């Protein structure tokens, strides 16, 4: 009967000490992301199952007016998720983070959907007193704000971790790696990293703006650190080196062009222009005047630095002292009128906050076969029975 189901449901829902353990250990900390691989497409069902489970439990708590229970429940949910994202490392960094980014997004979008309802439809005032409704509204509101905070947090944390993972590979792959014959990580490693980001976000049904934001940030970061590596290289900067650098950066550019990013070049401006300098002639004063127009993103001090560390090749005529003089004279000129590019460290704006929330027409009751959650499964199954009856 219905009252039986409601009874056992109540008994299960007020039992916070078991539900919290099960949720925070088996579902959150014991999360298993599809180890199949990032390139492999999934149904949303297999991506946001924890959030949907949490949504069913929460909505059923709110059904029986268990506000305090929901408070503790969601406090531990938020804290646990942020902690889980904070502790990520290794080969699981990309797939796991995105996973949680999906789930948080699934949770937020629901909380939002709840608030609106509570405010819009009068029916939700029927079974509760004025001040219970008041504290209810207060709860859901503050919860919305807290989930904004959580989304922001795990996004920035994950992105910073990504920057950390790029740090090592990118400098060796872009500055030191030599692809072309006749002129350890390579460009294939970088390209593989970005391939993994792209495919992961694609398969976990993540919105594109987030992808654009992440890759833009990471690329600006690479441009910055690699420029900061180049402008310090002393017995390194040459025409051949310029050629190979140009080739590598070109590979990144092609990756951007082929993966839907229009503003890649703009994100790689400093490396592109440093590559352009090292190749164009720097013998005539005319050549330097043209060089000023080509490197429209480089300060005269940086130009002077790059030029003053140009390593000449066999039988190659050195950069004229008249030219070094002229350049130092333009630097002198515009000094009156630092050389390193400081990399943006974050925190950045959450891209999820710049798009519409996910609509919530329906919630699918589904608890993955391999999952071990007795109480939660009992709750979801009871609710499912109740829906089957109606």
């Amino acid at each position: 009967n219905a009252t039986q189901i409601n009874e056992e449901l109540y008994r299960l829902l007020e039992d916070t000490e078991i539900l919290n353990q099960e949720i925070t250990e088996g579902l959150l900390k014991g999360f298993e992301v599809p180890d199949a691989g990032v390139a492999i497409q999934l149904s949303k069902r297999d991506v946001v199952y924890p959030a949907r489970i949490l949504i069913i439990v929460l909505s059923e708590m709110w059904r029986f007016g268990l506000t305090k229970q929901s408070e503790s429940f969601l406090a531990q949910v938020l804290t646990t998720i942020q902690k889980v994202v904070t502790q990520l490392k290794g080969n699981d960094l990309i797939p796991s983070g995105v996973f949680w980014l999906a789930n948080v997004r699934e949770l937020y979008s629901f909380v939002v959907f709840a608030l609106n309802s509570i405010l819009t439809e009068e029916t939700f005032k029927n079974g509760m007193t004025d001040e219970e409704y008041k504290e209810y509204v207060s709860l859901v509101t503050e919860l919305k704000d807290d989930f904004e905070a959580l989304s922001y947090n795990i996004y920035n944390i994950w992105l910073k971790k990504l920057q950390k993972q790029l740090q090592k590979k990118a400098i060796n792959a872009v500055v030191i790696s030599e692809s072309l014959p006749g002129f350890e990580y390579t460009m294939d490693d970088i390209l593989t990293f970005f391939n993994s980001i792209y495919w992961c976000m694609k398969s976990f049904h993540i919105e594109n703006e987030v992808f654009h934001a992440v890759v833009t940030t990471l690329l600006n970061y690479v441009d910055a650190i690699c420029f900061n590596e180049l402008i310090m290289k002393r017995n390194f900067l040459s025409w051949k080196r310029g050629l190979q650098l140009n080739y590598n950066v070109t590979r990144l550019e092609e990756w951007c062009k082929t993966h839907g990013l229009t503003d890649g070049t703009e994100c790689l401006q400093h490396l592109i222009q440093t590559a352009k300098l090292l190749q164009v002639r720097k013998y005539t004063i005319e050549d330097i005047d043209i060089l000023r127009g080509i490197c429209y993103s480089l300060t005269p001090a940086q130009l002077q630095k790059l030029i003053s560390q140009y390593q000449v090749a066999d039988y190659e005529s050195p950069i004229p002292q008249e030219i070094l003089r002229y350049v130092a004279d333009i630097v002198k000129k515009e000094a009156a009128l630092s050389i390193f590019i400081t990399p943006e460290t974050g925190p950045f704006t959450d891209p999820f906050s710049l798009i519409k929330t996910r609509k919530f027409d329906q919630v699918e009751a589904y608890i993955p076969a391999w999952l071990s959650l007795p109480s939660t499964k009992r709750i979801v199954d009871l609710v499912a029975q109740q829906v089957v009856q109606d």
């Binding site: 904070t86 490392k89 950390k164």
Partner: peptide, 18 residues
């Protein structure tokens, strides 16, 4: 709850994670 948004120092703490 009342979760606090991450700052620059927090991100710097995360940077030097083992």
């Amino acid at each position: 709850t009342r979760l606090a948004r991450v700052s620059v120092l927090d991100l710097k703490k995360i940077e030097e994670q083992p």
